[PDB]
Amino acid sequence: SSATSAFERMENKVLDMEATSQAAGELAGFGIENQFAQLEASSGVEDELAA
Amino acid sequence: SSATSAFERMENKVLDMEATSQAAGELAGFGIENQFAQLEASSGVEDELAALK
Amino acid sequence: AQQRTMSENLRRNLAALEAKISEAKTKKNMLQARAKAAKANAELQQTLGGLGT
Amino acid sequence: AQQRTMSENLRRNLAALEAKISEAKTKKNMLQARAKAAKANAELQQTLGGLGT
Amino acid sequence: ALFDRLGRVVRANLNDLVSKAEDPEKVLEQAVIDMQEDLVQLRQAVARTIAEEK
Amino acid sequence: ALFDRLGRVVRANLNDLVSKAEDPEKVLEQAVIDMQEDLVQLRQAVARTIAEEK
Amino acid sequence: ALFDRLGRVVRANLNDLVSKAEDPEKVLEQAVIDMQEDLVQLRQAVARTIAEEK
Amino acid sequence: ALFDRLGRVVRANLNDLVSKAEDPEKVLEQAVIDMQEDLVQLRQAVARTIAEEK
Amino acid sequence: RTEQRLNQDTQEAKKWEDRAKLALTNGEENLAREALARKKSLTDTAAAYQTQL
Amino acid sequence: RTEQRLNQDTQEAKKWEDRAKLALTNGEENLAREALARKKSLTDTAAAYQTQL
Numbered sequence: 001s002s003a004t005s006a007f008e009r010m011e012n013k014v015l016d017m018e019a020t021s022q023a024a025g026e027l028a029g030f031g032i033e034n035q036f037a038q039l040e041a042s043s044g045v046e047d048e049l050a051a
Numbered sequence: 052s053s054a055t056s057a058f059e060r061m062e063n064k065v066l067d068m069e070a071t072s073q074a075a076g077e078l079a080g081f082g083i084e085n086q087f088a089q090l091e092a093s094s095g096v097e098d099e100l101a102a103l104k
Numbered sequence: 105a106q107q108r109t110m111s112e113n114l115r116r117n118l119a120a121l122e123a124k125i126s127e128a129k130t131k132k133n134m135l136q137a138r139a140k141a142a143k144a145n146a147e148l149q150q151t152l153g154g155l156g157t
Numbered sequence: 158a159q160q161r162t163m164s165e166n167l168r169r170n171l172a173a174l175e176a177k178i179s180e181a182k183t184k185k186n187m188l189q190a191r192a193k194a195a196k197a198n199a200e201l202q203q204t205l206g207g208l209g210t
Numbered sequence: 211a212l213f214d215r216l217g218r219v220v221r222a223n224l225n226d227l228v229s230k231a232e233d234p235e236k237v238l239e240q241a242v243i244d245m246q247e248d249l250v251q252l253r254q255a256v257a258r259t260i261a262e263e264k
Numbered sequence: 265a266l267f268d269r270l271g272r273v274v275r276a277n278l279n280d281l282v283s284k285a286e287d288p289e290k291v292l293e294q295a296v297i298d299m300q301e302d303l304v305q306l307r308q309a310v311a312r313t314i315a316e317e318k
Numbered sequence: 319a320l321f322d323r324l325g326r327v328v329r330a331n332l333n334d335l336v337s338k339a340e341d342p343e344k345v346l347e348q349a350v351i352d353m354q355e356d357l358v359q360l361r362q363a364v365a366r367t368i369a370e371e372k
Numbered sequence: 373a374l375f376d377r378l379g380r381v382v383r384a385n386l387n388d389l390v391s392k393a394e395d396p397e398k399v400l401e402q403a404v405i406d407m408q409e410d411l412v413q414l415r416q417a418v419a420r421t422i423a424e425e426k
Numbered sequence: 427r428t429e430q431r432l433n434q435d436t437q438e439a440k441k442w443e444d445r446a447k448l449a450l451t452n453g454e455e456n457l458a459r460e461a462l463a464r465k466k467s468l469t470d471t472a473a474a475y476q477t478q479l
Numbered sequence: 480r481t482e483q484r485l486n487q488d489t490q491e492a493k494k495w496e497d498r499a500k501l502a503l504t505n506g507e508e509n510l511a512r513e514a515l516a517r518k519k520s521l522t523d524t525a526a527a528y529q530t531q532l
């Protein structure tokens with residue numbers, strides 16, 4: 001009956017293809033921040049000059 | 052016969068299983084810290100050098 | 105006055121119930137999606153895993 | 158007056174028992190988790206172990 | 211004590227057998243279907259207390 | 265007294281056997297079930313008491 | 319040890335018999351067919367989380 | 373002790389026979405299967421633990 | 427296959443090096459340290475594969 | 480095969496020995512001792528193999 005039990009059953013199988021997440025976890029955190037930052041900044045000054 | 056007594060019994064059994072596993076590893080060859088200590092010290096000096104340049 | 109305050113409280117119990125059911129529907133569906141995701145991952149881990157037929 | 162005094166005593170004891178049961182319930186889950194983790198660690202140690210055939 | 215412990219062991223074993231047999235996804239789904247029905251039943255009953263109030 | 269000693273050995277063996285037969289995963293869970301089962305009935309009594317007070 | 323080794327030898331032999339019987343080209347093909355189906359099932363389930371989000 | 377010696381000979385022969393019966397190609401592979409089978413179950417435990425932590 | 431594995435690990439090591447440095451520029455030494463540990467980890471694995479090749 | 484086993488043991492002995500340098504720098508005295516003791520046992524093993532060879 002438990003919704004929680006339903007979640008667990010699924011939750012394990014999710015586990016087997018690696019889910020400790022030392023990659024996805026690590027990656028995303030500093031990735032999204034750093035990339036967009038340096039990108040738009042440098043790019044933007046250069047763009048405006050030519051416009 | 053009571054639930055609480057049964058629980059205390061299962062709880063001790065579980066703690067004993069955690070303890071068995073821990074001891075079993077040490078006897079087997081437990082390194083961990085060794086590797087960990089070197090990787091900690093390496094990342095440190097490397098970041099320092101990285102930052103320096 | 106007795107009927108009005110009784111009905112108001114009963115109405116509140118009804119709203120609470122509905123809110124909880126809404127919550128359960130939202131939860132149900134994300135778990136179904138996650139379950140299908142787990143299954144899909146498993147199939148790729150099978151086909152594109154190690155050796156065998 | 159007698160009813161009010163006595164029905165309040167019963168509430169103190171229900172409240173204590175509720176704290177108690179929920180304690181066991183939460184510990185039940187984490188203990189099962191700890192136990193499965195430990196059980197598994199022991200299994201891996203045996204499989205990975207080179208001692209014995 | 212022997213049988214008292216046997217009883218506890220037995221109930222747990224029985225509950226586990228139930229848990230094993232128990233598809234949790236149908237339980238949760240089936241549950242939503244019944245909860246929705248109950249919600250509707252409550253709405254009708256409430257409708258009657260509103261009629262009476264009026 | 266040898267009869268009593270024999271009984272003690274028999275019971276000790278059987279008590280050890282049923283202790284061995286415990287499955288914490290099943291049993292710990294079952295124990296909690298018993299706790300809840302029991303509470304529900306206490307709540308029913310507190311339910312009556314409260315109603316009587318009113 | 320004798321039976322412990324026998325067990326390992328036996329499982330390997332059994333797996334090999336399976337590997338032998340196993341057409342790998344149908345496995346891979348069959349797999350793509352199921353993976354495509356699963357992809358579709360995920361798309362529907364995702365569609366529901368999108369509906370809920372909206 | 374002659375009984376124990378006889379047993380040792382019997383077991384040694386049978387151990388040599390099952391060692392001979394090993395097929396590295398099958399067996400080495402089977403051993404890896406066992407490793408994976410075992411890991412999967414560890415991962416399930418780590419799965420629960422992580423969920424409980426959350 | 428071994429040749430392929432070696433190159434793949436080498437490439438990932440370069441991406442993690444880049445990431446450590448980008449993160450370091452943006453700030454946070456501890457974050458850079460974490461990235462470096464992974465960088466080293468992949469570098470070490472790559473070395474092993476090189477020798478194997 | 481004798482040569483192959485022994486050669487290997489000599490490489491493993493260096494890995495313990497060069498690990499001991501890092502442990503000593505850190506101030507991991509017990510880990511450093513165990514590493515040296517491991518190096519001794521491998522040295523003893525290697526000697527036994529040479530004779531055998």
Ligand SMILES: Nc1ncnc2c1ncn2[C@@H]1O[C@H](COP(=O)(O)OP(=O)(O)O)[C@@H](O)[C@H]1O
Nearest residue numbers: 016149153154155156401404405408409411412
């Ligand atoms: N030789 C093999 N190598 C890898 N996997 C295999 C092999 N033979 C069969 N398999 C199947 O592939 C799965 C590999 O286990 P899995 O834990 O997914 O791998 P990993 O531990 O690398 O993630 C097993 O469940 C097994 O049924």
